Design an enzyme around this catalytic site. Sequence first.
Site: not given
Length: 329
Positions: A156, A30
Amino acid sequence: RPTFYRQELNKTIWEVPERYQNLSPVGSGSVCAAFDTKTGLRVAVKKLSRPFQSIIHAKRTYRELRLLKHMKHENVIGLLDVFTPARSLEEFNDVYLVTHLMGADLNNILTDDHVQFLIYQILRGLKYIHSADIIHRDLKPSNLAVNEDCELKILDFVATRWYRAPEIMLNWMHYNQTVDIWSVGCIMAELLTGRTLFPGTDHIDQLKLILRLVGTPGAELLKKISSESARNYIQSLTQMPKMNFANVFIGANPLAVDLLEKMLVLDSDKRITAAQALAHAYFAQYHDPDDEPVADPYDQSFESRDLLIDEWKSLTYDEVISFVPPPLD
Ligand SMILES: Nc1ccc2c(NCc3cccs3)nc(-c3ccccc3)nc2c1
């Protein structure tokens, strides 16, 4: 050793230092948007999901912390902070990563002058990354964060295959860094046309569209393919000629067309590098040879090591404790 405060946000619990305030869920490990009281910046806090669940997870967590700690470049995402609620290695189970809050991605976003600046920043970031012997492998618009100022950062963590170099989908080992340059070409082509260049339905259909543009390979490329099955399949296709890029990209800057010709080459030995591309005439207005730096050496030797979970976990704990915060400006 700061004070920690806890709150339940949506699914999971969050224990973060007091300096990070006003947590707001953004995505799902999250990620929460928050306000950093130490610097006054808006930041993104990412809580990793089960970082030490398996040998593969523990090494992946370790890999991510090592890469982010190493990146120090304007066009590559950087690590503002890394922390854990744990007081010891013995109670260490959760990892949180803190980066600048980036406005949007290239997908969420074009003039020719915008494409120059945007592609120039990607190539500038790729030169840095590639100089450390790091290959991104997954360049695509959702991995590119853009400001309201049009400032770009490589990230990334819309099909991935649409931007993948053809050698990766043929499962060639020993591919080089220019698989990323192929991705840049696909991205630059999309910004110039508004259409995905190779919207392949799958891996077979993807190669069909690619070869329709660049043509079937000649005998110079065929004599370098080690796989006999791959060599026969390629040689059995109906020969398609290379299309003229000026015809396909009609109306675009001829310098932009010339660069796409040099990026979208089947033979990766002939494909243009990030450094070579930075000196292309298409970037004459932004290119500065004294302000396109390379990276410090990066030790990748851990990748070839097989270790237990507790060992990757301990190596990750070391990297959390040794973290030096970046200087405030
Ligand atoms: N020096 C080079 C340059 C390019 C190559 C390439 N390019 C992908 C394609 C070549 C022809 C049609 S797709 N593919 C392979 C390869 C090797 C073994 C198995 C499958 C593919 N090798 C290449 C070696």
